[PDB]
Amino acid sequence: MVLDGPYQPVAFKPPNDYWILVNSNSNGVVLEGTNNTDVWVAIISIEPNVNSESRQYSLFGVNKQITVVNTSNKWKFMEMFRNNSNAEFQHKRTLTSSTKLVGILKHGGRLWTYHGETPNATTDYSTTSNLNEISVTTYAEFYIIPRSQESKCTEYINTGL
């Protein structure tokens, strides 16, 4: 395998057609992304064996209380989303993972993430009218993988580095 990185946590405007593959370790905000017009996405990490409860998270500089549950032996990554700066976030998608790897991609007018349960997690999208202005802040080391090698990214998501 050949893998581009690791890059340190930073705020940046990812180029189109590169997966950002974040190697998360601790249980808070893994990454968040916004164009400040119609996309706000944040992926939050919950450790295994967590009964339903409220937890605090800083999303885009504002503190939010979010109810979480994870009675799995895997880690759970909740994809929180809103398309309007005045709305509250919604739990849009879930990725349940034993590898603790998370991805985000700008491509084809859409924003892509992984969801499902490893080893069978697959990509899904959010729409936007302003893809290019989406910048991403990662809170852990990450790699970049061209979209032409997405099958490898998917493999990493599902079975690890």
**Bind-site residues for N-acetyl-D-glucosamine:** 147, 150
* Domains of the chain listed by start with CATH number: 3-161 (2.60.120.200)
Q: Which of 7, 20, 15 is nearest to 102 (CA)?
A: 20
The C-alpha atoms of residue 80 and residue 77 are separated, in whole angstroms, by 9
Q: Which of 118, 112, 126 is nearest to 81 (CA)?
A: 126
Burial grade of 102 (CB within 10 A; 0-12, 13-18, 19 or more) = buried
Q: Give the DSSP letter of residue 18.
A: E
Residue with tokens 């009964």: 51
The C-alpha atoms of residue 68 and residue 45 are separated, in whole angstroms, by 10
3-state secondary structure of 148: helix
Residues present in the chain in total: 161
Q: Can you name the residues that pair with 59 across neighbouring β-strands? A: 62
Which resolution in angstroms does this entry have? 2.1
> Rounded to the nearest 5 degrees, what angle is found at the Cα of 159, between the Cα atoms of 58 and 16?
60
**Bind-site residues:** 147, 150
